[PDB]
Amino acid sequence: SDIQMTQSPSSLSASVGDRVTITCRASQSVSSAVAWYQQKPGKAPKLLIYSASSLYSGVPSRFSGSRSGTDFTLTISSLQPEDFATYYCQQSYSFPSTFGQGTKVEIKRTVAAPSVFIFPPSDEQLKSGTASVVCLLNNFYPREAKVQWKVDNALQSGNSQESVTEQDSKDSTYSLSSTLTLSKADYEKHKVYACEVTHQGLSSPVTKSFNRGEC
Amino acid sequence: SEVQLVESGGGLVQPGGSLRLSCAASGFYISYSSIHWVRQAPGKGLEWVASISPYSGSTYYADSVKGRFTISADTSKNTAYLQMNSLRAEDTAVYYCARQGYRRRSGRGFDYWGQGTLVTVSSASTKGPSVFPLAPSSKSTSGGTAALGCLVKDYFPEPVTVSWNSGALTSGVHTFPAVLQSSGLYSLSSVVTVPSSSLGTQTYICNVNHKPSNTKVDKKVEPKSCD
RNA sequence: GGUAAAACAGCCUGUGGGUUGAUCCCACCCACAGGGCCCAUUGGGCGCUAGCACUCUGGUAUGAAACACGUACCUUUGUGCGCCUGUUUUACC
């Protein structure tokens, strides 16, 4: 039976200088054969801690690991800006090896409302038979945000996709794009295209809209 | 650093197809080490795949790849391999080679990792993107700030790169993670916020490069002529 | 009374009954009833700070080494040897 490594929390928001503790709980004995890694977006993981509590050569002393039975902790005594990253535990007591699901440590900051922009499909795209309508939520915090598409005041569902940037290195905000996809024939059936945005920094939802074909 | 691992052999493969990945070591000899493969699906966590032990050649596999993948190592070529058969969409991932370090120095920790190589398992065919403008408007402003961009639609496989004004424009640029569409093709947007007063005099060009299809597109993004 | 040798019983604790001696009376047996500790558990084992050898089960440390190989160990299973107590014998004093 494969050894499970249950890692918690899945995400942490902390201010620079805060202490954070990340926990990984094994489902069977793994002795002390537990390693911790740091990974930044687009980069390979880096070893931090081996054998549950030993600091890997060259790793700063603010990182530490501890074992209590089958529960393992990684502690960062005082976060520095370069420490915001994803962290993974790993058991290598027996095969098959198991990584924990990861903890993403992100920077806490004050609330910032998104700036919202809506883009009609280009005339060029329309000639080919598809309409992509794009809604941009720029530089907001925290990450949690709700985008709703309305077409002549009818709520859309299932025909949009969104994605979110990684937290900005300068201002610690997020940005989000949502794309609504329609056929050209369906697009031409309606006039008002609206993106309605709910966010903690907005006392009431903001709607940006355009009339199909207006300047 | 002198110690390096370099994965190669990734790319597109059809469901049910085969690929062999290579892991070339430099600055150390793999014959004194265990070598491991670890993979990461887009936006997901690390998943251990397979390993091979020194001096015995013993091999170990994750249940998720048992019977389909074979790990091996060539002492003379100082290279490890992952033969992958019967691939499925869910095997799409960046595949890393990793050195398990020396027992006395770092226990069983994996002390060196390659940069990884992307494997995409899909029935879709390679295709360069269509690039459409996201035009600014004066009626669409956040104060004196306007937004514009490029929609990079219907390309396959990952990745694409976007720059603005050939890398001269970096401030305020957000290039979003791609989404996989139901068609099996990817799409992403890249935007930038600029002063509204600049829109008449300042030119904006997004430079889109899709290496898998040898496609490069430069798209000028302008206010609509009526604006 | 003692000495020596080959045996037999002993995880721990009851409750009956038998054995075989007149009664008695322990030892053995039998049944029953429980209560622990361990193991590799449709079940099996446990007299032992008196332990040893080999063998297995599962482990540790180490050699650039999780397995395999070498080295030094621990543990468990089984077997043999040793040991303690109790009882019965045989040789001898």
Residue numbers in the entry:
A (entry chain L): 1 to 215
B (entry chain H): 3 to 229
The paper states:
Enteroviruses contain conserved RNA structures at the extreme 5′ end of their genomes that recruit essential proteins 3CD and PCBP2 to promote genome replication. Previously, the phylogenetic and biochemical probing analyses have proposed that the domain I (called replication-linked RNA, REPLR hereafter) folds into a cloverleaf-like RNA secondary structure with a base-stem, sA, and three stem-loops, sB, sC and sD. Here, we determined the crystal structures of the coxsackievirus B3 and rhinoviruses B14 and C15 REPLRs at 1.54, 2.2 and 2.54 Å resolution, revealing a highly conserved H-type four-way junction fold with co-axially stacked sA-sD and sB-sC helices that are stabilized by a long-range A•C•U base-triple.
To access the potential influence of the Fab binding tag sequence and subsequent Fab binding on the H-shaped conformation, we crystallized and determined the structure of the same CVB3 REPLR using the same Fab-assisted crystallography approach, but this time, the Fab-binding tag replaces the sD loop rather than the sB loop. Both sD and sB loop mutant constructs for crystallization (designated CVB3-DLmut and CVB3-BLmut, respectively) bound the Fab BL3–6 similarly, indicating that sD and sB loops are equally accessible to the Fab, consistent with the H-shaped topology and antiparallel positioning of the sB and sD loops as observed in our previous CVB3–BLmut crystal structure. The CVB3 REPLR crystal structure reported here with the Fab-binding motif engineered in the sD loop also exhibits the same topology, supporting that the enteroviral REPLRs have modular subdomain structures with the sB and sD loops distal to each other, not favoring tertiary interactions between these loops. In the bulge of the CVB3-DLmut construct, the U49 is flipped out, and A50 forms a base triple involving the A50, C48 and G82 through hydrogen bonding interactions, where C48 and G82 form the Watson-Crick base pair, the A50 Sugar-Edge interacts with C48 O2 and G82 N2, and the A50 N1 contact G82 2′OH through a hydrogen bonding. This bulge structure was slightly different in the previously reported CVB3–BLmut construct, where U49 remained within the helical stack and was involved in the U49•G51–C78 base-triple formation, and the A50 flipped out of the helix and interacted with the symmetry-mate Fab molecule, which is further stabilized by the hydrogen bonding interactions of the G51 O4′ and A50 N3 with the A50 2′OH. Nevertheless, these structural variations may reflect a high dynamicity of the bulge, and thus, each crystal structure perhaps represents a sampled conformation of the bulge within these CVB3 REPLR crystal structures.
